[model samples]
Target: MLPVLWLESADTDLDDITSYIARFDIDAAERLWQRLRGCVLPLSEHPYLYPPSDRVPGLREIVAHPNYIILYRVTTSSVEVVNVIHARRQFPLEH
Candidate 1:
């Protein structure tokens, strides 16, 4: 099973998201955070089934509260959190 993934870009995304939410109501912000925390599920059976992994097809997206999106794919050893980017920014174009 893949362990819970880590967004290597968490520092950037987390900072942006927190700043975005801090400008809004606290309760609403917390709600999104809770949902975000729940979205990170572990994949144990076939973690690295996907390969090369420049990108994983059919990936499901989860937004963390304010403006960040959590993009991920399951790998044999861990969940590869491809990125966490602002919702309004242009997504990856070099794929």
Candidate 2:
């Protein structure tokens, strides 16, 4: 497993997510980040197991924002990225 990396969303994504999370609760922001940090494992530990896919290598867990599925993917030759994605949306699309 490669090192874990953080792939942040656009400013709009961050604002939208952090803002709403901040409203109902303040710790939401930190909590989500912490969860992301804690869960991401080094290549040696390799904590979470992911489903097989062609697009990318990562893991998805649902928490804090149920509407989203956090994607934590690792590549055979690249660093891992713990991503927060909308649950209903498809990710890893051409950008």
Candidate 3:
């Protein structure tokens, strides 16, 4: 499998997600965390399985959960995870 790396910001996004959900339900938070990590592993073999997002021309996204999307960029050596955002949240244009 190709290397899969999570950028600093992307790691923060994941922490924020789990911390927020854990306040309400630890089980749910753990489940989402697993799903997010699981989603990243598959990118090694199928980096382009997800469609390019309009929010950012070259980036692609996969739904890690019903309410969250894991956005990433494919590079020659690795799959760089950019962020994990709530489905209803607006992605920054600069990203």
Candidates in order: C-alpha RMSD to true structure: 5.8, 5.0, 3.1
Question: Which tens-of-lDDT digit does each residue in 1-95 have in candidate 1?
Answer: 45776665654555556566767777765776666666655334544432432344655465544565667666546676666666677633331
Give candidate 1's whole-model lDDT. 0.57
In model 1, the Cα lDDT at residue 6 comes to 68
- What do the candidate models score in CA lDDT, each in turn? 0.57, 0.53, 0.84
What is the Å distance of residue 5 in model 2 from its true position?
1.6
lDDT of predicted model 2: 0.53
Model 1 lDDT, residue 95, Cα: 19
| Per-residue lDDT of model 2, residues 73-95, tens digit only | 55565444555655666543434
- What is the clash count of model 3? 0
Winner on lDDT (1 vs 3): 3
Model 2 lDDT, residue 90, Cα: 59
Cα lDDT for residue 65, candidate 3: 76
**What digit string (tens of lDDT, one per residue) describes model 3 on residues 1-95?**
56889999988777777887899999998988888878899889988789998878889989777778988999888999988898986642233
- Candidate 1 to truth, TM: 0.58
Ranking by TM-score: 3, 1, 2
* True-structure lDDT of candidate 3: 0.84
Q: What TM-score number comes out for model 2?
A: 0.53
TM-score of each: 0.58, 0.53, 0.88
CA shift of 41, model 3, Å: 0.5
Where does the lowest 10-residue lDDT sum fall in candidate 3? 86-95
Candidate 1 clashing pairs, residues 3+ apart or interchain? 1-44, 2-43, 47-75, 47-76, 48-75, 48-76
